[PDB]
């Protein structure tokens with residue numbers, strides 16, 4: 013594939029994120045879990061329990077199979093439901109709630125983000141963490157102003173008719189080689205997210221771009237790097253990976 017380095021970079025960053033906020037025996041609530049790729053990662057992390065939730069039944073299906081045919085130590089749970097736009101009560105708290113490449117889908121509407129943030133807060137143990145990897149609105153708009161919103165690997169189209177402020181835009185279409193097609197994404201209203209979380213007892217403790225994060229952790233953990241071809245990136249690739257940022261909140 014032409015997206016291998018990108019995939020490896022993203023998994024690495026994700027692996028480092030997990031490594032940074034999870035301790036042995038932790039309980040993890042993976043939201044928008046998808047096919048459950050992070051299962052192997054949580055395994056190396058020695059977590060005690062893993063709960064996977066995704067609105068797409070088709071995704072949960074692959075996650076189940078995955079958890080079923082893998083050498084794992086933690087207990088596993090799965091549920092196919094909307095964890096952002098519909099009330100959720102799994103009946104227990106977690107040490108770490110993870111949303112990898114999907115919490116932005118929680119910004120469809122004002123009410124939607126509210127439910128989502130409230131769903132994260134009621135399932136998070138005091139002191140627990142909410143780790144995430146969301147697309148950066150600042151980045152996307154700046155690239156917008158550069159008139160360069162694509163290349164071989166991806167493409168982004170902002171939805172804005174005549175007489176419409178740029179800052180007014182709340183969604184765009186995203187396409188990634190060997191992945192989503194004209195997939196609609198909602199911009200992360202950072203300030204609204206932060207505030208909303210502050211009222212629920214969660215405060216921001218981290219926010220860094222994928223390239224710097226990639227670079228930093230890379231110069232501080234060369235071992236896991238080599239363990240997956242991680243050793244550099246082209247400019248085209250870096251632009252895809254450059255789209256995202258790491259954001260962590262903590263229930264204080």
Ligand SMILES: CN(CC[C@H](N)C(=O)O)C[C@H]1O[C@@H](n2cnc3c(N)ncnc32)[C@H](O)[C@@H]1O
Nearest residue numbers: 044045046066067068094095096112113114117
């Ligand atoms: C990029 N997919 C996650 C991959 C996985 N988290 C990873 O890190 O590899 C995004 C997932 O978001 C999920 N999703 C979208 N909207 C919602 C929602 N409202 N509630 C739960 N999951 C959602 C989709 O079903 C999709 O599987």
